[PDB]
């Protein structure tokens, strides 16, 4: 019930910029959004927690924005090992992640 | 004597947990005797440090030292809402002694400042 | 650090309830939600419920509301910060939609707002 | 050793009194002894409530606890201008356990919101 | 114990250095045992001072007494300039009691007169 962008891609040395938009019972001004960088099938990887906060480890690339009807993935300055898939969730504080379409790169 | 309750909160998160007369020199009485002093020597101990910081009678103080990097490079959400302050000690326990050491002088120049502040 | 090791790759037909494991090494077991995710293969990514190793909380999705059990065993104390816990969860009527690789991660923080979040995973068994 | 002249107005209002070394174990050395460690017992004894209620080197600090009447029902004018200190303190001495408590607690909460007032 | 280090400067000007347990009654035992307890005496003699004059967790405390010109003739100049703190105490040593006297009103006074302001 969470859409997000198609697809998009670019070269090394841009950027590019996930969007994660939905109806008003998942997005977003009243509950926080992650962003995962997840091969499909294999350990995925927690890039952003509630909105825009990086998680231990992440490279000052990876920044996050969220306005009133849509949070945004800017992967800043792509890398090869950058072009896998990537998944938003929806929660809050007392609930769970409710996974988006997905978008690759 | 005092109080243990402050330990209550031992392995919460370091944002929940700060949220008769007569002398006989008997073997007992020995031992009563250095238990009395060992307890005003560690109290002023610590409470002299809080005096020389400018922080005499305050549980939590802020200070105008800037908190160096390369102390901690964690976040803080990965400080207050994860390490339990028995743990976050271990971690910082190498520049304690540096930060003491800062502490005490910031305290020291904001005292010439208001020296001079006040002569006005 | 850490490691969540699950179990093994065991599949089944349809009507069976398939136990998956998930025993942890190098953290505080009951300080960090347990929390399992599945990726169907003509599905997306779906989230299936957290259970608090400590409080004995839980809490899962309406697809799975009562489909899956997931239980875990008190920890084995390894020192004052590591422990060696153990999660298992089953599935009720299972057919082959549920068909597909399914994980166990452990929680973001132990307070605030995202205290809950699947922030490392574990390695992924394989089903039906 | 520090002054009996607060005492002077034992019988006054309220109002009126508000405004060599070596150590030798003999029968006199060790009574001498403890009266020097009994002093600077009782002394943080009453300067650790000072300073964990937010008033170290204050004579007169006022709180925010605000006064429960049932205490005492008595007038501003029957209290500082009629009874002393030393008869105030019996008609009160079952609340001072429960009146130290809060006083105790107002001043924590009082930290933790100047740490988030002066964060900004 | 502490530090000798602020004797650094004895010779300097005003402007300039301002700017295991169990206890044994054996002879060394009695003698490290009221070295422990001579500490802490002394310490607090100094500190009970600083507290009564409203100066506690305060290196520089500016007061409200005004320099009586009979205690010191000299310049600002002469003094801060010029004199040390150890030949500085030796011309005033005879009003040192006649000064920390006013000090201790002073406090006194400072406290009343906010009690009277904070009840507004
Ligand atoms: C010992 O260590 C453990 C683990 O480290 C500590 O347990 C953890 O505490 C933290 C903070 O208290 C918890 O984070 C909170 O999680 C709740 C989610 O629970 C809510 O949702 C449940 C399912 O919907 C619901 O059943 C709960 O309702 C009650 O029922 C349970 C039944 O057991 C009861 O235990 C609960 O306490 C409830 O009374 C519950 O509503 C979430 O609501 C919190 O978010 C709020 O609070 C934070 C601030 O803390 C704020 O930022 C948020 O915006 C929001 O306002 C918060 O995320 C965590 O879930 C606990 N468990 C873990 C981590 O496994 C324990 O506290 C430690 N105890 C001691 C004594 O040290």
């Known amino acids: 019930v969470l859409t997000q962008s198609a697809s998009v891609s670019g070269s090394l040395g841009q950027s590019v910029t996930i969007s994660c938009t939905g109806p008003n019972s998942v997005c977003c001004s009243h509950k926080s959004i992650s962003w995962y960088q997840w091969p499909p099938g294999r350990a995925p990887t927690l890039i952003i927690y509630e909105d825009n906060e990086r998680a231990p480890g992440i490279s000052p690339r990876f920044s996050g924005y969220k306005s009133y009807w849509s949070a945004y993935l800017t992967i800043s300055d792509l890398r090869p090992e950058d072009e896998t898939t990537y998944y938003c969730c929806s929660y809050t504080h007392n609930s769970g992640c409710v996974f988006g379409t997905g978008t690759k790169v | 004597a005092v109080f243990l309750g402050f330990l209550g909160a031992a392995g919460s998160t370091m944002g929940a947990a700060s949220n008769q007369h007569l002398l006989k020199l008997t073997v007992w009485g020995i031992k009563q005797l250095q238990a009395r002093v060992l307890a005003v020597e560690r109290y002023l101990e610590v409470q002299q440090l809080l005096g020389i910081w400018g922080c005499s009678g305050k549980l939590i103080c802020c200070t105008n030292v800037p908190w160096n990097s390369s102390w901690s490079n964690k976040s803080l959400d990965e400080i207050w809402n994860n390490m339990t302050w028995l743990q976050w000690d271990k971690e910082i326990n190498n520049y304690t002694q540096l930060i003491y050491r800062l502490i005490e002088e910031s305290q020291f120049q904001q005292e010439i400042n208001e020296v001079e502040l006040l002569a006005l | 650090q850490g490691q969540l090791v699950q179990s093994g790759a065991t599949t089944t037909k349809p009507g069976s309830s398939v136990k998956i494991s998930c025993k942890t090494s190098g953290y505080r077991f009951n300080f960090y939600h347990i929390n399992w995710i599945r990726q169907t293969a003509g599905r997306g990514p779906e989230w299936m419920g957290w259970?608090?190793?400590?409080?004995?909380?839980?809490?899962?999705?309406?697809?799975?509301?009562?489909r899956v059990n997931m239980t875990t065993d008190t920890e084995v104390p390894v020192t004052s910060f590591t422990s060696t816990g153990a999660a298992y969860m089953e599935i009720r009527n299972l057919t082959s939609d549920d068909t597909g690789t399914y994980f166990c991660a452990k929680g973001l923080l132990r307070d605030g707002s995202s205290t809950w979040l699947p922030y490392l995973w574990g390695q992924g068994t394989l089903l039906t | 050793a520090v002054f009996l002249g607060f005492l002077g107005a034992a019988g006054s209002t309220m109002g009126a009194a508000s405004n060599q070394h070596l150590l030798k174990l003999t029968v006199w050395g060790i009574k001498q002894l403890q009266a020097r460690v009994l002093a600077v017992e009782r002394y943080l004894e009453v300067q650790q409530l000072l300073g964990i209620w937010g008033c170290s080197g204050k004579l007169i600090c006022c709180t925010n606890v605000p006064w429960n009447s049932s205490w005492s029902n008595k007038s501003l004018d029957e209290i500082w201008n009629n009874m002393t200190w030393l008869q105030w303190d019996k008609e009160i001495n079952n609340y001072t356990q429960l009146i130290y408590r809060l006083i105790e607690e107002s001043q924590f909460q009082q930290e933790i919101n100047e740490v988030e007032l002066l964060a900004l | 114990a502490v530090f000798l280090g602020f004797l650094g400067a004895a010779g300097s000007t005003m402007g300039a250095a301002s700017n295991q347990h169990l206890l044994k009654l054996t002879v060394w035992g009695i003698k490290q045992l009221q070295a422990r307890v001579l500490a802490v005496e002394r310490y607090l003699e100094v500190q009970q001072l600083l507290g009564i004059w409203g100066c506690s967790g305060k290196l520089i405390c500016c007061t409200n007494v005004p320099w009586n010109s009979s205690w010191s003739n000299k310049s600002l100049d002469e003094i801060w300039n010029n004199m040390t703190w150890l030949q500085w105490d030796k011309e005033i040593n005879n009003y040192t009691q006649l000064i920390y006297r006013l000090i201790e009103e002073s406090q006194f006074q400072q406290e009343i007169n906010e009690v009277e302001l904070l009840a507004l």
């Open positions: 259970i608090s190793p400590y409080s004995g909380d839980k809490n899962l999705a309406p697809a799975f509301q009562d």
